[PDB]
From Swiss-Prot, chain A:
Protein family per UniProt: Belongs to the turreted BTV-fold inner capsid family.
Signal peptide: none
Quaternary structure, from the entry: Homodecamer; each decamer is made up of two conformers of VP2, called VP2A and VP2B. 12 homodecamers assemble to form an icosahedral capsid.
Coiled-coil residue spans: none
Known function: Inner capsid protein that self-assembles to form an icosahedral capsid with a T=2 symmetry, which consists of 120 copies of VP2, with channels at each of its five-fold vertices. This capsid constitutes the innermost concentric layer of the viral mature particle.
Identification of the protein by name: Inner capsid protein VP1
Compartment(s) where it occurs, according to its Swiss-Prot or TrEMBL record: Virion
Upper taxonomic lineage: Viruses, Riboviria, Orthornavirae, Duplornaviricota, Resentoviricetes
Swiss-Prot record, chain B:
Task of the protein: Inner capsid protein that self-assembles to form an icosahedral capsid with a T=2 symmetry, which consists of 120 copies of VP2, with channels at each of its five-fold vertices. This capsid constitutes the innermost concentric layer of the viral mature particle.
Organism, as annotated: Bombyx mori cytoplasmic polyhedrosis virus (BmCPV)
Residues included from the entire protein: 1285 to 1333 of 1333
Subunit details: Homodecamer; each decamer is made up of two conformers of VP2, called VP2A and VP2B. 12 homodecamers assemble to form an icosahedral capsid.
Name the record gives this protein: Inner capsid protein VP1
Family that this chain belongs to: Belongs to the turreted BTV-fold inner capsid family.
Subcellular location, record wording: Virion
Amino acid sequence: YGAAVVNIDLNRDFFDTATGIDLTKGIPLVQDLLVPIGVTAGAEQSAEY
Amino acid sequence: QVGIPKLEVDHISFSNVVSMMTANIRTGDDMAVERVNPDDVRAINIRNA
């Protein structure tokens, strides 16, 4: 009783940090896999999705 | 009759009407601009003239 919102997430326990995935933002986010060239720093982040 | 131009004749003339600015042209507010770069070099459109 008193749960505000119940969401369906990807399972952090399966998709572990060992997978290089980061599920804290609500989406998988793998750093430095695909990444655009020729863009200003911090423009890479959407690719992390 | 209209007056003969001073350059047209050979006489020297020591009083003349010179146009002049009332004060210095170089006020010191030199123009400056906000250059902003292309976001991604790959996306730039070299084409079309």
